[PDB]
Amino acid sequence: MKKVFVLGAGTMGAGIVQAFAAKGCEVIVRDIKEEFVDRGIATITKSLSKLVAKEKITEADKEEILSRISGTTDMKLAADCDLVVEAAIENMKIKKEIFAELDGICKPETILASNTSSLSITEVASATKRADKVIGMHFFNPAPVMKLVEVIRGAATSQETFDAVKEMSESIGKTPVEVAEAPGFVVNRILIPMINEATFILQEGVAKEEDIDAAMKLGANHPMGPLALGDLIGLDVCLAIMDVLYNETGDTKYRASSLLRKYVRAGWLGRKTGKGFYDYSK
Amino acid sequence: MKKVFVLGAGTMGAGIVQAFAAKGCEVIVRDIKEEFVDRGIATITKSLSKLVAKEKITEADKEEILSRISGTTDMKLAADCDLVVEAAIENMKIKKEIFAELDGICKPETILASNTSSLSITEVASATKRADKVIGMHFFNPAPVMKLVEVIRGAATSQETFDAVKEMSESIGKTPVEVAEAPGFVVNRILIPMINEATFILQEGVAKEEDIDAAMKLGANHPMGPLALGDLIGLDVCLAIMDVLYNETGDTKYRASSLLRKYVRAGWLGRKTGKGFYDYSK
Numbered sequence A, B: 001m002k003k004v005f006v007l008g009a010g011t012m013g014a015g016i017v018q019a020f021a022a023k024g025c026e027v028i029v030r031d032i033k034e035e036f037v038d039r040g041i042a043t044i045t046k047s048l049s050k051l052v053a054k055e056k057i058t059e060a061d062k063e064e065i066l067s068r069i070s071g072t073t074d075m076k077l078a079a080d081c082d083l084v085v086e087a088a089i090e091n092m093k094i095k096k097e098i099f100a101e102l103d104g105i106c107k108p109e110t111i112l113a114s115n116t117s118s119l120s121i122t123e124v125a126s127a128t129k130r131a132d133k134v135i136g137m138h139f140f141n142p143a144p145v146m147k148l149v150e151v152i153r154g155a156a157t158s159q160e161t162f163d164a165v166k167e168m169s170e171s172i173g174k175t176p177v178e179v180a181e182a183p184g185f186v187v188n189r190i191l192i193p194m195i196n197e198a199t200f201i202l203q204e205g206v207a208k209e210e211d212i213d214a215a216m217k218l219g220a221n222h223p224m225g226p227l228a229l230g231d232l233i234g235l236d237v238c239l240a241i242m243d244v245l246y247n248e249t250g251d252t253k254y255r256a257s258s259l260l261r262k263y264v265r266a267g268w269l270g271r272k273t274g275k276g277f278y279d280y281s282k
């Protein structure tokens, strides 16, 4: 599978597109308006320049990756691609429309994959007549660098479809891991409550921000502490993920701290608002 | 603090002996049998050679260090020490008696600190009449190398004992962090439940061992995955800590999985037994 259709062209779409293109795939990327696609492309172009300045790749590799990527708003261009990776907005109604339409359009061979962090693949695939070829392909930000893809098997995802997505992932130099679908998969299910735990510690006056983080970094060799990491993932995202784990499981274990909900209601979302657990400046 | 008494010639107490001595403190290490003390002094000795091999230090340094360390099995030898660091077995009734004993032996100014991961500094302090001078000094294995020390204030630990242990942590080149005593402090309170969650992920069929650990390594940039890390800490230790956190809080969030109890009951404790989540060799 060398021809890849990617829907959406924000952070993860752009990153995913680059990931596929950088290892020689032909990639079409589809967004809604035309300035979105352009942005997605300029995003990727800025990222590759950062790789050239690092002397990680040549200016020629950059032009070549770019040469492998095309923009469109036409969903019909999906019809002859080997893999679709949907990385549009995290809304179930819409993902179900996208996947239905994609079911109509694409040849019967095409595998259809979502990059959703928090929505059920099984539920998405149920909107199609291709459940055996719907699958989750959950990448990690920034997708061109991070080597993991959680490969999320829905209830009806075939062995054959999993094996194909696995080889496809290795073919672009990523390490796929098989996941029977469950909330939070593996990574977010471990990582996020670890961040929520650091909010509880703080809320219960056990220790202060800088200390909680130094402790995780020096005591556990984590490259960044949990609170900084929350500020970096976004506190709204952290909060939404603890809510999904809690609503899906009914398990009081995944209850978010009151302090986290308050920071999100203040708009203290982290870096991207210049304030979360830490105050930031440009 | 010129002079340090350490209880325990085991893994940690040997490591803590080394951490102090190697920065020029005198140290008296006390265990309950000579064999043990000997074992301990050999361990510092072989660890100091290793440094020597890589020209981290020369022989004169090594033996200069070794000359600062004396062994004993008599508690009464703590009478002139400036700081005690108790790293004996994790058992309340024993710690209480040690600390009662130390309170009788030591000059009024000596600070009594414990390296306990899971017992209340405050309860230990109440077995003495010098609660203001009792504190936890929680090091990380290997104590020579790992920089962090969680400094754990009991309810009655004074500002001046805190300030003193802080300066002393720094003076041996460690980074102290202030902790108001609560179960699991900071590090283990985040880290251990993370390993327990991975055991839950495994028990519920979500994904297999190696995949869980590649996920956390490649998806979150953690230096090791949590299952391997559990095997390294010892699953008996993971379980005990989840059990303290659960009995101390009454919160079901910290309930250990059944898979964890089962592995512990099989003797599959980790590397130390040659088998935990993974099978090991030599």
Ligand SMILES: NC(=O)c1ccc[n+]([C@@H]2O[C@H](COP(=O)([O-])OP(=O)(O)OC[C@H]3O[C@@H](n4cnc5c(N)ncnc54)[C@H](O)[C@@H]3O)[C@@H](O)[C@H]2O)c1
Residues within 6 Å of the ligand: A007, A008, A009, A010, A011, A012, A013, A030, A031, A032, A036, A086, A087, A088, A089, A090, A094, A098, A115, A116, A117, A118, A138, A139, A140, A141
């Ligand atoms: N760090 C992360 O953002 C991250 C990591 C892993 C997974 N995810 C998941 O990836 C998905 C996308 O997240 P993102 O961060 O790129 O969001 P984003 O908001 O930055 O980008 C979403 C893009 O999808 C486009 N879009 C909306 N409706 C569309 C449609 N019908 N067709 C084509 N494009 C459409 C939008 O125009 C937008 O450009 C979500 O499912 C999210 O849960 C995100």
Ligand SMILES: NC(=O)c1ccc[n+]([C@@H]2O[C@H](COP(=O)([O-])OP(=O)(O)OC[C@H]3O[C@@H](n4cnc5c(N)ncnc54)[C@H](O)[C@@H]3O)[C@@H](O)[C@H]2O)c1
Residues within 6 Å of the ligand: B007, B008, B009, B010, B011, B012, B013, B030, B031, B032, B036, B086, B087, B088, B089, B090, B091, B094, B098, B115, B116, B117, B118, B138, B139, B140, B141
């Ligand atoms: N990784 C770790 O081992 C680790 C890390 C952080 C904290 N701790 C804590 O530090 C303490 C020691 O654990 P360890 O791993 O070194 O155990 P260990 O079994 O390696 O050594 C404990 C030593 O204490 C000795 N001992 C028992 N009763 C004693 C007494 N009354 N006086 C003097 N010595 C006595 C034993 O002879 C033994 O050699 C525990 O409280 C534990 O929770 C351990």
